[PDB]
Amino acid sequence: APVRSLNCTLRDSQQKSLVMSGPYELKALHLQGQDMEQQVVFSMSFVQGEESNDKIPVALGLKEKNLYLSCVLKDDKPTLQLESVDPKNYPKKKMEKRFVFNKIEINNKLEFESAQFPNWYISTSQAENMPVFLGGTKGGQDITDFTMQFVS
Numbered sequence: 001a002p003v004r005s006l007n008c009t010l011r012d013s014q015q016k017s018l019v020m021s022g023p024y025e026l027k028a029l030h031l032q033g034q035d036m037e038q039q040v041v042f043s044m045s046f047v048q049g050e051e052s053n054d055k056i057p058v059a060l061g062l063k064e065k066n067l068y069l070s071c072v073l074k075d076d077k078p079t080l081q082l083e084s085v086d087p088k089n090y091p092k093k094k095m096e097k098r099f100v101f102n103k104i105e106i107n108n109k110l111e112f113e114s115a116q117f118p119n120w121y122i123s124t125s126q127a128e129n130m131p132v133f134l135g136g137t138k139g140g141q142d143i144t145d146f147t148m149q150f151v152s
């Protein structure tokens, strides 16, 4: 049948919210109050892929926009991009591998590993107003843990 999707927001474990940074980038910043309306709402789709109790393959589309987070090689490195799709063939159950993240639940937090690039994670910087990126370790100064908030 159809693919199943949930609307949600994400915050990093330092409780930074995600906002648009021009058309094809996200950035993370500390937000509260009125400015919370700026945060990106995701449509998280539950897609085809290798699955276990704590590791669930998802696509992170933007709610009612034909824009997906995707993992591609850029200037020879795994990078995070926002990619446009045909709003007539998405969202689907069999999403292409560049769009798939393994949503991993460890110690009441979420990590989003690239299915295409093992051990590369959706990441934020500690500094305010810096891009969301794909980082090649769930260790060090960069932040790889998130919480999800469910949206109506």
Ligand SMILES: CC(=O)N[C@H]1CNc2ccccc2C1
Binding pocket: 019, 020, 037, 038, 039, 040, 041, 042, 062, 063, 065
């Ligand atoms: C123009 C703009 O920055 N809008 C925000 C708020 N709402 C929203 C909803 C879905 C996906 C992204 C967004 C970002």
